[PDB]
């Protein structure tokens, strides 16, 4: 079905590095150069106040829409990823349901400026205070902290490509039917990532990477906060939240 569902040679691992990096470059939503250039474009005190005065539900809807747009690029990344389309549909959905948000959270560190603790949102950079109307301060602060920690690693685009491919191809996801096929694909993607680190003298980041339960904790907190919001504004979720967002985070 795919070469990467079996043991791969060094030459095949080298090809996998290139393939993953190409798939990422074609699906990365925003260019790193564009994000870096925009660092000087910061929301004014008046703009921040405007976001803070928005209703909780208007702010949740805006953020759900932005997250859904980012997730759509992750779905395209998955489709272009060696071996992914050779998995069964059940397993493709299991992997995307569990991993799409995790991939977005990792990608987000490119849009986060560690110098002033701001994130690119709706055309400009703003601090965590921009999200005060959401009423999930702990989750927002946890996401900013995570982006800060990833930013300290100074990831290259290729490192993000390989790391996010691994976040997605996780054979430990509950519900996988063809677990052994996923395990082999994961092993080869682990080799590709570690090969690239070895070749670029970046193996020192391995001990500095987030622990696996960190991404899981952020995703669990997001689903919990959505459930609290849904109790407060159920018709907002039913009428105005993106269908893909509901399919992933509120069982449809």
């Amino acid at each position: 079905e795919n070469l990467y569902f079996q043991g791969a040679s060094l030459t095949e691992i080298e090809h996998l590095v290139q393939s993953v990096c190409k798939s990422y470059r074609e699906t990365c939503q925003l260019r790193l150069e564009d994000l870096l250039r925009q660092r000087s474009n910061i929301f004014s005190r008046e703009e921040v106040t405007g976001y803070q005065r928005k209703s909780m539900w208007e702010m949740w809807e805006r953020c759900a829409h932005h997250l859904t747009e980012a997730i759509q690029y992750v779905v395209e990344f998955a489709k272009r990823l060696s071996g992914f389309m050779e998995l069964c549909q059940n397993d493709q959905i299991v992997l995307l349901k569990a991993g799409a948000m995790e991939v977005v959270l990792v990608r987000m560190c490119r849009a986060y400026n560690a110098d002033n603790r701001t994130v690119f949102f709706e055309g400009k950079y703003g601090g965590m205070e921009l999200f005060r109307a959401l009423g999930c301060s702990e989750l927002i602060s946890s996401i900013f902290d995570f982006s800060h920690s990833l930013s300290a690693l100074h990831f290259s685009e290729d490192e993000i490509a390989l790391y996010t491919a691994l976040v997605l191809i996780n054979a430990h996801r509950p519900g996988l039917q063809e677990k052994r096929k996923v395990e082999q694909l994961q092993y080869n993607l682990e080799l590709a990532f570690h090969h690239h680190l070895c070749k670029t003298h970046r193996q020192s980041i391995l001990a500095k990477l987030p622990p696996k339960g960190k991404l899981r904790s952020l995703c669990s907190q997001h689903v919990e906060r959505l459930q609290i919001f849904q109790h407060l504004h159920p018709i907002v979720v039913q009428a105005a939240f993106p269908p893909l967002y509901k399919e992933l985070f509120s069982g449809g």
Binding site: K79, I93, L96, P243, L244, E247, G252
Partner: peptide, 12 residues
């Protein structure tokens, strides 16, 4: 139901 993911995965 998985209405959107199935469609995105099937669209080439």
């Amino acid at each position: 139901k998985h209405k959107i993911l199935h469609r995105l995965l099937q669209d080439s």
